[PDB]
Design a protein around this ligand. Structure first.
Ligand SMILES: [Zn+2]
Ligand SMILES: [Zn+2]
Ligand SMILES: [Zn+2]
Lengths: 85, 1180, 66
């Protein structure tokens, strides 16, 4: 049930927690963070305002795509928030 | 092989154009889009000139361009939608002269895609919402707001997707501060994909859909949708709110409709037609562009048809309802892609091809007798009008544009030493052959040759607030003559100089105090008739001086440095110290003392010593040596100048030096550009300083906002010159030649080529050069075209049929219809028919423009190939071969046959005489001389042909080429074939076996447009999609042959791949400058010219690679594109460095220039010099 | 599957070919110098070529089978 949200991303910036701080959301790499992550409006609302996009804990820093995912334009899909059903 | 790309002349074709107050002031500017270049223009309301302010390469494909303004603001923004998945908003900064990116919003993947938005862009007329749309289901809406600091904020997008839907056009609707509305022309194709009968494809209508954005609820909803009568092209926003109703104008085939939601009925008006039209009666009529002009009292529209007819559309209204649409014929101009109506009464026309125009709207209102059509008028049958020459408009300016370039040849067809560029460009009756030369064009100002020995001429005015000069003083060897401008310039007496001996310095000393220096001394002259004279002690005689309106230094025999000064009293006081050195001066120069300071300090001194010495002259440390630097040769003159301070060093040869003004030299640049001494003279270009260097050829040296240019001029040698000013022309030059006294002018705002044009009849396809006479043999061909004879007989037919209209047979419009033919270069050619062609063969002299011979072909014959050659079985006679198609249909493709014509080219290459005509079963698309015979590509077939007495004799044939032969090129042993869809086939001709054998091919499909041989093994190719590639045979390649991929056994390797962004149609290896290196020059369909040059060392390649790497990150493309991804559009880049990205280093800000330069272990001036070196090595 | 133009093991020749015809026409509308080439080749205004391509967008390759 690890599925990405894949909704139209807005102006909200994705956040990472203390455990996931250096990670890439899509491929889980740690090398060369390149592009700032954007999330949709339903992922950024109320109690969901600041939360890790990978796990859902309290965010502390910005989420980034890696250079490898940026080269393949994998930052052009929807909201990359991990959502469980 | 590693290549460096440089642009020599940018594209000049316009795709979109918007107007607005982009600088925030009250003047209006236009932003035009080239394919990949953004450009800001400003037309002068005083003279009507259009000046270019800024031009930026965006490294993408611009697809939509809008302007918008927030409520209460005075500045317009720019919204750009491109082939990236981003929408960008830009702001022009007048004080920095650059485009500042305000916002970037990413929504999808890059490229020109079906369902990713970026093709359509609409904006709310009040500026609170913007809609970006694709051709398919996806649409997005952004809300635009403003914070308390008056900066622009953007929201997250709202989706309005709708599957199985096609969009023709989107516009925002003007409401009165109500919820924003957007109108769309839409079509649903779901039913058409499920019906195998094909009846759901027909019976399918366009809808006009309205989308309402509810700012209170924050969502987009479909409110209204209505089916239309027929399919329409673009929409027009009608101004609403408190000035006008709020609807849309739908432009359609033969009609224009007004529509609004509510209780408003639909109003239709048919488009008028030209009386006695010569075009095919089955064809309809559409509008191609529009322009709105809103005034605080009324509004109207300007729409143009495909024939180039502009009509003026007004709207007859009620309190809220519209009742009539009225159309009135306005004028005829070339077919435009965009039209902008400017306040202060100017109309800007950007044509689809050829030159662009700016018109003055001379006649406001409409007080005329010509009829006005209406929607209320009843007609069973259509309206008719008569096209006439311009009545409402006056032509004020014309901007040159090389788009579209179709064929090019670089060659020295005149007997200069520099080659010229012969360019067949243009389409239809506006085509032409243009000759391009590197230089500036000297405008003739005045000529009166007087006998004597002219040496020098100044242009000094009587006052300092004077814009009118006082005198011009040309010195003989025995005397001089000094004149004034009484608009009838001749001898003058009350000047006060009256020099019996020559005059070597004439300066404006005071406000109206003049310094006259001559070999026997100096006589300072007042405003009143008074002279104070200091003459020579004994036999020492001055030759050189250095003047300035506050201080005057002189040079007697022996380097005796004598400095004067004129203090606020207004008279002479000489300094105490006279420093003398070993030799006599040959050069010095005093910088123009600025109004900010009191006097000039630096004085470069060039002597027989061959050393520049820098000396101070302020009362603190005046006249004592500071720094000396030897010379490479004998100097003639130097000059401290600006446009920050530099000096220039002229040698006695045709070579130059440069050194930036400082206590120590900081920059160095030498250009081998003569064998004759350089003369450095003062002039003023662009209203600021510039130096006119002179040699066997005369050059102008001028930086331009850090754009250094050493450009020659289109005239031969001179010997002295300076600025000029008069009621006749307040800004010019006074130049002297052998047995001549000239005044000249230069009025071209920073161009690289000057061009002359010669008109043609149809679209030129290809031309060849006669080797003996240097004449050009051109073929011109057009589709949907009549020949001359068919036009004449069709017109006679229409006359005889309109005279028998069965009606008093008493008044003849037919004799008036037959007399004068409206010019096709102004009113267009009658485009009539679908399989109709028109072709012509022309012999032209390239020096003049005269047509030597003209052969017209039959109606439906279309020429595609031409060649000039000699046959071995004949003598030294020349022949011209023309390949012609017969009854060609393009879609679906069908042809009846082909012919090859043969002519004898007699009378010293001036006349063609028909010999015979050989039939072939397909279009002969390529003809190439080959070993005393000729090769012809007949569709899929490659044939050898020898000359016969009654026709051409087939000798050999290969039948294994894939699809269609589009080009043939031969190097002595081998043949290179271009396929329409496959790239390249290598063939060998077996001379003794009489065989054509394929021995190599490629592994990629390429849509080849042109090809160029680089050496015995390598070929340079171009593509329809905008790519250039280089293909080389491996060294293993065996030539002596008697498939592995369903192809040939041996393959060729691709060693170069580059995306240019525009379609290349010409490639040629040549040397552009005398004494330079060979480069690969290409030509583009948008009017651009560029080169690819090889690197010779690994160090230069590595340095430029690192520059490109670092500039890719810290200076990204403006519209959101990835630079490496753009040059890898269809294939990945291979061994090319983008020098158009690299030269953007000179236009960054100093902080980022330092951050970039300190990584390359270098300073910005060194990087700039290294960038200029490789450019001046090959190109200009 | 949600992207228009993708296929699967049951895709027919007709669907494949109409998909590539449709995105070919969109690519022609997008790229500025391809439309120039076509408008010079067939001697028409660029607005007319654009409108013709949009009209051809509806049913390229004819109506489907059976
Ligand atoms: Zn990643
Ligand atoms: Zn986490
Ligand atoms: Zn989400």
């Amino acid at each position: 049930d690890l599925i990405f949200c894949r909704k139209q991303a807005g102006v909200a910036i994705g956040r990472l927690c203390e455990k996931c701080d250096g990670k890439c959301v899509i491929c889980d790499s740690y090398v060369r963070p390149c592009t700032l992550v954007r999330i949709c409006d339903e992922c950024n609302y109320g109690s969901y305002q600041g939360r890790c996009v990978i796990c859902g804990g309290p965010g502390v820093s910005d989420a980034y795509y890696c250079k490898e995912c940026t080269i393949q334009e994998k930052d052009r899909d929807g909201c990359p928030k991990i959502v469980n059903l | 092989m590693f290549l460096y790309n440089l642009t020599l002349q940018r594209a000049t074709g316009i795709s979109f154009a918007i107007h607005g107050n982009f600088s925030g002031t009250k003047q209006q500017e236009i932003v035009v889009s080239r394919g990949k270049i953004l450009e800001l223009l400003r037309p002068d309301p005083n003279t009507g000139k259009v000046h270019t302010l800024l031009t930026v390469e965006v490294f993408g494909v611009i697809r939509s361009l809008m302007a918008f303004r927030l409520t209460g603001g005075t500045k317009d923004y720019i919204v750009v939608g491109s082939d990236s998945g981003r929408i960008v908003i830009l702001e022009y900064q007048p004080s920095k002269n650059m485009f500042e990116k305000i916002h970037q919003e990413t929504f999808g993947k890059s490229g020109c895609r079906r369902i990713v938005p970026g093709q359509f862009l609409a904006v709310d007329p009040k500026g609170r919402a913007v809609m970006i749309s694709a051709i398919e289901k996806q649409k997005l809406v952004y809300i635009l707001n403003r914070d308390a600091a008056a900066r622009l904020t953007i929201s997250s997008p709202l989706e309005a997707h709708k599957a199985n839907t096609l969009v023709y056009h989107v516009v925002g609707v003007d409401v009165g501060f109500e919820n924003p509305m957007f109108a769309c022309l839409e079509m649903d194709y779901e039913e058409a994909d499920n019906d195998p009968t094909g009846e759901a494809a027909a019976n399918t209508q366009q809808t006009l859909t309205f989308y309402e954005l509810d700012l209170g609820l924050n969502h987009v909803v479909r409110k209204y949708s209505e089916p239309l009568e027929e399919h329409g092209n673009f929409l027009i926003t009608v101004p609403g709110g408190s000035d006008g109703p709020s609807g849309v104008l739908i432009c359609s085939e033969n009609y224009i409709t007004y529509k609004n939601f509510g209780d408003q009925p639909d109003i239709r008006c048919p488009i008028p037609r030209r009386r006695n039209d010569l075009d095919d009666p089955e064809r309809g009529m559409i509008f191609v562009c529009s322009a709105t002009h809103k005034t605080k009292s009324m509004f109207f529209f300007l729409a143009q048809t495909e024939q180039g007819d502009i009509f003026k559309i007004t709207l007859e209204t009620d309190e809220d309802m519209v009742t009539e649409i009225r159309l009135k014929y306005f004028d005829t101009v070339p077919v435009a892609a965009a039209m902008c109506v400017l306040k202060t009464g100017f109309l800007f026309v950007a044509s689809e091809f050829g030159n662009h125009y700016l018109y003055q709207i001379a006649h406001l209102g409409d007080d005329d007798e010509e009829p006005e059509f209406s929607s209320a008028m009843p007609l069973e049958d259509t309206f008719f009008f008569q096209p006439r020459p311009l009545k409402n408009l006056v032509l004020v300016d014309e901007l040159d544009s090389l788009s579209p370039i179709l064929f090019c040849q670089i060659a020295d067809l005149a007997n200069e030493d520099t080659p010229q560029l012969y360019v067949a460009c243009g389409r239809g009756p506006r085509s032409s052959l243009r000759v391009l030369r590197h230089g500036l064009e000297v405008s003739e100002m005045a000529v009166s040759e007087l006998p004597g020995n002219p040496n020098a001429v100044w242009t000094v005015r009587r006052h300092i607030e004077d814009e009118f000069d006082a005198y011009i003083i040309v010195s003989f060897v025995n005397a001089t003559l000094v004149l004034s401008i009484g608009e009838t310039v001749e001898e003058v007496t009350d000047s006060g100089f009256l020099g019996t001996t020559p005059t070597l310095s004439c300066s404006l000393l005071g406000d109206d105090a003049l310094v006259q220096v001559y070999p026997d001394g100096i006589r300072h002259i007042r405003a009143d008739k008074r002279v104070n004279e200091w003459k020579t002690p004994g036999k020492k005689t001055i030759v050189k001086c250095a003047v300035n309106q506050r201080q005057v230094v002189i040079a007697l025999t022996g380097g005796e440095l004598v400095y004067f000064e004129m203090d606020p009293s207004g008279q002479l006081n000489e300094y105490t110290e006279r420093k003398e050195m070993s030799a006599d001066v040959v050069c010095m120069s005093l910088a123009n003392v600025p109004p900010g300071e009191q006097r000039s300090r630096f004085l470069a001194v060039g002597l027989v010593d061959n050393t520049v010495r820098i000396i101070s002259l302020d009362p603190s440390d005046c006249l004592q040596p500071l720094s000396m630097q030897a010379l490479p040769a004998q100097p003639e003159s130097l000059c401290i100048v600006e446009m920050f301070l530099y000096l220039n060093i002229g040698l006695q040869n045709g070579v130059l030096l440069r050194t930036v003004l400082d206590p120590v030299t900081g920059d160095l640049s030498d250009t081998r550009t003569g064998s004759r001494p350089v003369k450095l003279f003062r002039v003023r270009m662009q209203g600021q300083e510039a130096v006119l260097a002179m040699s066997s050829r005369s050059w102008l040296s001028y930086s331009y906002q850090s754009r250094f240019h050493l450009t020659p001029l289109s005239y031969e040698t001179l010997e002295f010159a300076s600025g000029f000013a008069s009621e006749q022309c307040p800004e010019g030059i006074v130049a002297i030649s052998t047995n001549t006294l000239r005044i000249l002018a230069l009025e071209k705002l920073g161009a690289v080529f000057n061009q002359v044009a010669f008109p043609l009849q149809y679209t030129p396809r290809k031309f060849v050069i006669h080797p003996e006479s240097n004449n050009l043999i051109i073929i011109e061909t057009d589709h949907n075209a009549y020949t001359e004879a068919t036009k004449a007989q069709r017109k006679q037919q229409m006359a005889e049929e309109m005279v028998e209209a069965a009606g008093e047979l008493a008044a003849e419009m037919a004799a008036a219809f037959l007399n004068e033919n409206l010019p096709e270069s102004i009113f267009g050619a009658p485009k009539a028919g679908n399989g109709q062609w028109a072709s012509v063969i022309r012999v032209m002299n390239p020096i003049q423009g005269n047509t030597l011979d003209l052969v017209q072909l039959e109606q439906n014959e279309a020429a595609f190939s031409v060649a000039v050659c000699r046959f071995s079985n004949t003598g030294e006679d020349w022949y011209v071969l023309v390949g012609v198609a017969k009854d060609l249909i393009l879609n679906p493709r069908s042809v009846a046959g082909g012919f090859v014509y043969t002519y004898k080219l007699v009378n010293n290459g001036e006349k063609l005489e028909f010999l015979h005509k050989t039939p072939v079963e397909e279009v002969p698309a390529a003809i190439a001389p080959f070993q005393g015979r000729v090769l012809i590509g007949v569709g899929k077939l490659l044939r050898v042909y020898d000359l016969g007495k009654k026709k051409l004799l087939r000798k050999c044939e290969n039948k294994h080429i894939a699809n269609y032969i589009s080009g043939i090129q031969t190097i002595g042993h081998r043949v290179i074939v271009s396929d329409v869809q496959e790239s390249f086939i290598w063939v060998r001709y077996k001379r003794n076996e009489n065989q054509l054998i394929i021995f190599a091919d490629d592994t990629y499909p390429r849509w080849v447009t042109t090809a160029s041989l680089l050496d015995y093994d390598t070929v340079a190719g171009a593509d329809k999609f905008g790519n250039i590639c280089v293909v080389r045979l491996p060294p293993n390649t065996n030539d002596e042959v008697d498939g592995l991929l369903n192809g040939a056994s041996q393959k060729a390797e691709v060693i170069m791949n580059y995306h240019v962004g525009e379609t290349v149609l010409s490639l040629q290896k040549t040397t552009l400058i005398p004494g330079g290196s060979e480069s690969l020059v290409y030509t583009t369909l948008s009017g651009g010219i560029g080169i690819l040059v090889p690197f010779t060392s690994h160090e230069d390649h590595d340095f430029f690679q690192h520059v490109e790497m670092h500039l890719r990150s810290e200076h990204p493309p403006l519209c959101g594109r990835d630079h490496l991804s753009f040059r890898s559009y269809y294939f990945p880049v291979k061994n090319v460095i983008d020098g158009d990205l690299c030269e953007q280093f000179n236009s960054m800000e100093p902080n980022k220039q330092k951050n970039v330069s300190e990584e390359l272990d270098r300073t910005p001036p060194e990087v700039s010099k290294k960038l200029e070196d490789i450019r001046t090595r090959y190109a200009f | 599957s949600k992207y228009i133009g993708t296929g699967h093991a049951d895709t027919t020749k007709w669907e494949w070919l109409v998909n590539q015809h449709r995105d070919s026409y969109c690519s022609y509308m997008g790229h500025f110098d391809l439309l120039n080439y076509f408008a010079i080749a067939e001697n028409e205004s660029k607005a007319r070529v654009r409108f013709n391509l949009m009209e051809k967008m509806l049913q390229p390759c004819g109506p489907p089978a059976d």
